Amino acid sequence: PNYKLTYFNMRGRAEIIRYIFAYLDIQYEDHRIEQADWPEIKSTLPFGKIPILEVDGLTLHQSLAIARYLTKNTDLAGNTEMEQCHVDAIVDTLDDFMSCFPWAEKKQDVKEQMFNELLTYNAPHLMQDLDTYLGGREWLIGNSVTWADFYWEICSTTLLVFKPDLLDNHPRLVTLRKKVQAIPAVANWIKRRPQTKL
Amino acid sequence: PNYKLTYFNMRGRAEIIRYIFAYLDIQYEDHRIEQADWPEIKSTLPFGKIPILEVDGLTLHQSLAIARYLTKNTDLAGNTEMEQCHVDAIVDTLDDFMSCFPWAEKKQDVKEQMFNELLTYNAPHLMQDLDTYLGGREWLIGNSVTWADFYWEICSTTLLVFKPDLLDNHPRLVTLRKKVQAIPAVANWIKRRPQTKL
Ligand SMILES: N[C@@H](CCC(=O)N[C@@H](CS)C(=O)NCC(=O)O)C(=O)O
Ligand SMILES: N[C@@H](CCC(=O)N[C@@H](CS)C(=O)NCC(=O)O)C(=O)O
Ligand SMILES: O=[N+]([O-])c1ccc(-c2cc[nH]n2)cc1
């Protein structure tokens, strides 16, 4: 199929889709827009938000809805309906936390203060929950990589930009990040992707 | 399997799971806890949030992850891979909006203000988006009911508690709620369920 991904020049909410395409060896057009192109694109969209994915001309929206759709019938989704449930739940837990951050806050001091509170209290709590959920296992769910591990690596990459020592007491979570990054298709993608802060 | 759902005594985030059990005619224990006993149960949970669904000796978490699991390979899932994506995307759009509400805000004045703002300034646009998206179809996705229709009915019910006039300019959206409420299994549940505000 002919896939076209639209988002800003940023990892952000589209990166999970980008990892999935890379891993599954699926070709797509990685369309990145500048704000000036947005108002016009936005007006054409039923829900006015990005990312969107156009599949043979038909437009899909909601990044995680799209990610799940792409992993359909692949090992990345989870090996059973039960494992798929754990995969979806871990993804949701991570998304719930990332949504706490005031990404669009215009008062720089308020943004800094909120980021700091979230990274001092909430983040370490979640890291301990994640660390114990993973235990000494290889991947978050089951015995092979799933898009939940991808989402962990992606979310943590963003959190580390703001609190570099966040995983300093969580070597098992660091090890999970390294295992995802070392998957050849992922390693390749990380090397060639546009470099952006977020 | 033996199902035990744990949540507060309210529709809230567990209601979608309750409609799914009803529709699929699956018996389950509808466990509802009092606030005072929550801190104790929270301490034993891998991620400290509810609802949770215990299936056999397994605990599951994240309401939508559970809803997705229970509807997989049932007539409540989309009819094609792409329809499944649209089902997930409409649910996520509704969820994104409902999760913006500060349900756990202890400062009453701050809470009411945020509620009023979201209901007055944001809710009408979501209604516009959903109305346009539905167009003239019978259901949100495809030619038959999906759990996205259930979620729409559930979310709108709560929104109408706070803003009764929300659907005055959207008869097609009122018609959809009525269609969902007309489904025998759903009608039966709406009639017999504990009648709570939220
Ligand atoms: N949960 C949705 C969120 C969509 C969303 O909030 N997108 C943002 C960009 S990260 C957006 O388009 N907001 C700016 C705007 O629409 O004007 C998803 O993952 O796709
Ligand atoms: N995204 C999660 C949200 C779960 C959630 O935030 N539940 C609330 C109750 S509505 C909760 O457990 N909060 C009480 C607490 O965290 O102490 C889901 O859909 O299940
Ligand atoms: O009254 N509540 O406490 C409450 C909490 C959450 C929701 C919710 C979140 C996403 N969908 N529905 C609805 C009601």
Side-chain angles (χ1 to χ4, degrees):
Chain A
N2 197 241
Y3 298 104
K4 181 176 174 179
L5 178 67
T6 303
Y7 192 62
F8 299 119
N9 182 31
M10 182 175 50
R11 296 183 309 279
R13 301 197 65 80
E15 198 66 4
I16 183 59
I17 297 173
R18 303 196 183 105
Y19 275 39
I20 293 170
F21 277 134
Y23 183 88
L24 293 172
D25 194 26
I26 299 174
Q27 307 298 345
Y28 71 105
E29 172 183 349
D30 189 29
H31 182 230
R32 294 163 186 254
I33 70 168
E34 288 191 354
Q35 303 199 39
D37 310 342
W38 185 224
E40 177 174 319
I41 297 297
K42 183 176 178 62
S43 63
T44 73
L45 309 182
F47 296 91
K49 287 177 175 56
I50 46 180
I52 67 169
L53 182 65
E54 303 176 39
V55 183
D56 286 338
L58 305 163
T59 298
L60 311 177
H61 72 114
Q62 279 292 356
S63 67
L64 299 177
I66 292 164
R68 184 171 304 100
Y69 161 78
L70 294 171
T71 65
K72 180 73 184 180
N73 296 332
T74 76
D75 284 13
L76 274 187
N79 294 129
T80 61
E81 293 80 4
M82 185 58 75
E83 296 195 346
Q84 295 167 4
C85 187
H86 303 306
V87 173
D88 284 344
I90 291 296
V91 170
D92 283 357
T93 292
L94 291 165
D95 196 59
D96 285 353
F97 185 60
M98 298 305 286
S99 80
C100 285
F101 293 82
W103 302 110
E105 177 63 60
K106 296 180 181 181
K107 311 304 182 185
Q108 300 184 20
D109 55 339
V110 169
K111 195 176 181 192
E112 187 183 357
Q113 192 269 20
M114 295 182 60
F115 269 65
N116 285 354
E117 293 178 348
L118 290 169
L119 290 159
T120 297
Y121 301 98
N122 308 57
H125 291 164
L126 178 63
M127 294 314 95
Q128 292 178 71
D129 286 359
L130 255 358
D131 195 330
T132 57
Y133 182 84
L134 177 63
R137 301 179 298 97
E138 189 171 7
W139 309 101
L140 285 162
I141 297 90
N143 46 46
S144 51
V145 69
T146 64
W147 66 288
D149 302 298
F150 279 15
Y151 207 51
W152 159 249
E153 192 279 337
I154 290 167
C155 293
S156 57
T157 286
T158 295
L159 296 168
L160 287 164
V161 165
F162 302 92
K163 188 185 177 181
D165 66 345
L166 178 65
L167 303 178
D168 282 5
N169 59 316
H170 299 286
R172 299 191 304 189
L173 292 182
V174 175
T175 290
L176 184 47
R177 285 173 48 74
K178 299 181 170 181
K179 317 220 318 151
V180 170
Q181 297 168 357
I183 298 173
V186 175
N188 183 235
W189 170 247
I190 291 177
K191 205 203 198 319
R192 61 191 173 93
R193 74 184 170 190
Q195 193 283 328
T196 58
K197 180 186 177 178
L198 298 177
Chain B
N2 203 342
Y3 293 109
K4 178 185 179 183
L5 178 68
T6 299
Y7 192 57
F8 293 117
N9 178 27
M10 60 178 60
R11 299 187 299 282
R13 304 184 212 255
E15 197 71 0
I16 189 57
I17 298 170
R18 302 190 188 105
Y19 279 38
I20 289 162
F21 280 140
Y23 184 86
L24 301 175
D25 192 26
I26 300 170
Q27 305 303 311
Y28 70 104
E29 174 179 352
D30 189 21
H31 188 235
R32 296 165 184 251
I33 67 174
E34 292 295 72
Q35 280 288 356
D37 299 341
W38 169 235
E40 190 157 348
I41 291 172
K42 182 188 181 68
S43 68
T44 75
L45 302 181
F47 295 101
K49 295 193 182 184
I50 50 176
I52 52 164
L53 179 63
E54 299 171 70
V55 188
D56 302 309
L58 323 150
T59 301
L60 291 178
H61 67 110
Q62 285 288 355
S63 64
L64 300 184
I66 296 161
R68 287 178 173 115
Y69 168 76
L70 298 172
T71 55
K72 200 158 290 173
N73 297 313
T74 68
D75 60 311
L76 289 174
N79 296 334
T80 67
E81 293 178 24
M82 185 173 301
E83 283 198 11
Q84 289 170 184
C85 180
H86 292 295
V87 168
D88 281 344
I90 290 304
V91 169
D92 290 351
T93 295
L94 289 170
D95 196 52
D96 286 356
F97 180 66
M98 302 302 291
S99 61
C100 280
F101 290 86
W103 305 101
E105 172 62 53
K106 297 190 71 171
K107 296 186 68 182
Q108 187 65 28
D109 62 339
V110 166
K111 189 182 186 187
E112 293 186 349
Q113 174 179 319
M114 287 163 176
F115 266 71
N116 291 335
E117 297 190 330
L118 286 166
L119 292 162
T120 307
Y121 315 146
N122 304 36
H125 297 294
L126 174 64
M127 301 308 98
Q128 183 53 241
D129 292 347
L130 287 166
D131 190 323
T132 298
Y133 172 82
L134 178 62
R137 287 91 68 14
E138 304 296 327
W139 308 97
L140 287 158
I141 296 79
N143 296 131
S144 65
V145 67
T146 60
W147 70 280
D149 299 301
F150 284 15
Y151 206 56
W152 158 244
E153 190 281 337
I154 295 170
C155 290
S156 60
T157 285
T158 289
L159 294 183
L160 290 164
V161 162
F162 302 112
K163 183 166 172 60
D165 73 356
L166 197 57
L167 299 177
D168 292 359
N169 282 234
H170 303 283
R172 285 171 295 275
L173 289 181
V174 168
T175 300
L176 179 56
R177 284 169 47 72
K178 294 188 193 291
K179 272 186 157 299
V180 173
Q181 299 160 351
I183 298 175
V186 175
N188 294 347
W189 172 246
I190 287 174
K191 183 77 172 61
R192 64 162 278 108
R193 73 180 170 197
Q195 307 292 332
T196 60
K197 185 192 176 182
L198 302 169

